Amino acid sequence: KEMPQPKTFGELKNLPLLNTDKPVQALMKIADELGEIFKFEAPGRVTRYLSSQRLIKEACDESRFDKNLSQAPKFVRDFAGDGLFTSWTHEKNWKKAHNILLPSFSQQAMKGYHAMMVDIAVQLVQKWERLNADEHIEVPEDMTRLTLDTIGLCGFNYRFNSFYRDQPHPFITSMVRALDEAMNKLRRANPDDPAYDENKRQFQEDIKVMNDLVDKIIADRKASGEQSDDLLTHMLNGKDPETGEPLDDENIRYQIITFLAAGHEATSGLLSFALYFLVKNPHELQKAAEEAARVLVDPVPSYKQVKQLKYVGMVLNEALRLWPTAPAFSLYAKEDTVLGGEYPLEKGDELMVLIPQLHRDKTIWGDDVEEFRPERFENPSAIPQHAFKPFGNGQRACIGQQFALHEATLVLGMMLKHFDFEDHTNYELDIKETLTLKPEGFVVKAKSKKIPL
Ligand code: HEM
Numbered sequence: 001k002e003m004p005q006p007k008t009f010g011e012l013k014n015l016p017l018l019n020t021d022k023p024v025q026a027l028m029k030i031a032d033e034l035g036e037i038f039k040f041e042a043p044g045r046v047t048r049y050l051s052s053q054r055l056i057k058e059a060c061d062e063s064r065f066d067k068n069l070s071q072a073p074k075f076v077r078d079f080a081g082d083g084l085f086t087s088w089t090h091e092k093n094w095k096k097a098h099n100i101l102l103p104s105f106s107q108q109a110m111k112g113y114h115a116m117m118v119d120i121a122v123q124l125v126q127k128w129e130r131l132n133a134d135e136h137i138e139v140p141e142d143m144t145r146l147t148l149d150t151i152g153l154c155g156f157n158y159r160f161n162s163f164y165r166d167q168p169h170p171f172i173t174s175m176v177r178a179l180d181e182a183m184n185k186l187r188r189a190n191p192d193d194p195a196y197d198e199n200k201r202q203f204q205e206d207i208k209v210m211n212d213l214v215d216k217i218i219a220d221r222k223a224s225g226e227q228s229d230d231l232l233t234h235m236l237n238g239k240d241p242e243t244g245e246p247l248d249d250e251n252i253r254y255q256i257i258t259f260l261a262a263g264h265e266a267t268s269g270l271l272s273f274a275l276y277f278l279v280k281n282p283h284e285l286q287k288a289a290e291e292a293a294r295v296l297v298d299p300v301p302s303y304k305q306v307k308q309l310k311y312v313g314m315v316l317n318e319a320l321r322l323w324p325t326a327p328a329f330s331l332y333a334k335e336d337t338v339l340g341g342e343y344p345l346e347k348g349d350e351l352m353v354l355i356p357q358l359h360r361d362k363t364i365w366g367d368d369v370e371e372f373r374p375e376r377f378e379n380p381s382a383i384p385q386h387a388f389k390p391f392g393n394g395q396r397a398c399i400g401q402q403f404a405l406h407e408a409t410l411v412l413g414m415m416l417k418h419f420d421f422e423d424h425t426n427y428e429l430d431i432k433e434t435l436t437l438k439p440e441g442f443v444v445k446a447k448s449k450k451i452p453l
Pocket residue numbers: 067084085086098151258259260262263264266267270324325326328329330390391392393395396397398399400401403404405
């Protein structure tokens with residue numbers, strides 16, 4: 001076919017379509033209107049947005065397509081360097097670091113991070129137990145406090161002490177502002193305007209704040225010789241089985257900045273959406289709370305108890321199906337190739353997988369795609385290959401997936417064990433877009449079940 005394309009803006013082509021606070025949500029509406037594929041042009045560039053399982057299962061063939069770094073990740077590369085997320089597959093440091101790090105991210109490795117994840121989860125539950133009668137919880141704010149502190153603790157045994165603050169640790173402040181600079185740089189008139197030189201000055205300082213802290217922690221760890229249960233230990237001790245080389249100190253720094261920058265926000269938004277869906281769906285909240293109570297029988301949850309929260313696991317997947325918090329990923333064609341038997345591609349052509357649309361493909365999931373039904377995930381095996389990709393694809397898939405889901409299942413499990421929730425404001429979903437998705441303004445009241453930690 002000749003591909004559908006959304007409205008244009010003279011020489012700017014489709015570009016001003018992404019000049020909005022909600023670009024992915026804009027793209028979903030365009031996908032609904034145009035179908036499983038549309039072209040998108042900007043000055044100097046072109047990509048094609050894929051929304052069907054039919055086409056995306058082809059895009060996910062690693063023999064034909066590789067990971068593309070799109071403009072946002074290209075700018076995040078300014079501070080995360082050749083860390084795993086912002087490396088190209090063909091860069092030596094990508095495969096090196098992937099080989100070294102994969103065993104530290106396995107489901108088995110979650111046993112060793114568990115105690116540290118509990119440490120922060122306990123701080124979350126204690127915070128809520130200590131709220132007064134007419135106070136409420138700011139959900140994405142508390143989730144992001146928890147996930148930042150959890151990754152800091154497991155990543156490099158550093159305590160950001162986010163539950164002790166209204167203004168985050170200076171590293172967090174600089175990171176979130178660096179992520180913001182990378183995102184705002186996408187929408188800029190003439191990016192070289194002298195009104196942005198402050199933004200530039202600020203970005204360079206934020207990079208410095210981040211490298212100085214992480215470089216110093218690596219330095220102190222090497223000097224102390226201490227062996228902890230964190231990823232920094234694993235990285236200073238590890239050797240690539242392939243090259244036989246260890247990561248160098250710079251690369252280790254970039255990995256740590258990556259884990260923090262890439263991991264915190266999608267995990268925090270997953271938890272937020274999942275609590276949003278349960279408060280809007282009381283029969284499913286009861287099924288999840290009933291499991292938490294039947295399963296988490298000890299003052300603090302064990303790793304094996306977390307693995308047993310099946311229904312919580314299914315809630316988390318259904319939240320990821322509706323609102324995958326890292327909503328898109330980009331590929332390039334390794335060679336000329338014909339997509340779907342219909343769309344000829346040239347070597348280097350880019351594709352964008354629009355994950356929220358994939359997950360609403362009625363031919364896969366049925367007609368009820370907007371409904372929240374954890375039971376869709378009751379059996380792992382019934383879901384067709386490439387139909388559910390909130391963690392992307394293949395060897396460039398999320399190395400943090402077992403970590404995110406262990407973290408999310410543990411904390412959602414404890415939250416449902418410890419409190420009844422009330423959607424006291426009848427909150428209207430408002431999805432804010434940064435690098436990730438979250439429900440902005442989502443607030444609840446919790447009433448303690450008065451169960452000891
Ligand atoms: C629910 C939470 C998460 C979601 C939805 C998510 C999603 C994703 C997706 C879609 C990608 C592929 C990006 C691409 O193709 O360009 C990815 C890659 C990656 N993720 Fe996650 N992620 C999450 C949590 C985490 C956490 C907790 C960590 C680390 C602690 C993490 C670390 C990374 C890294 C390093 C990569 C790059 C992997 C590579 O290419 O070798 N993520 N993630």
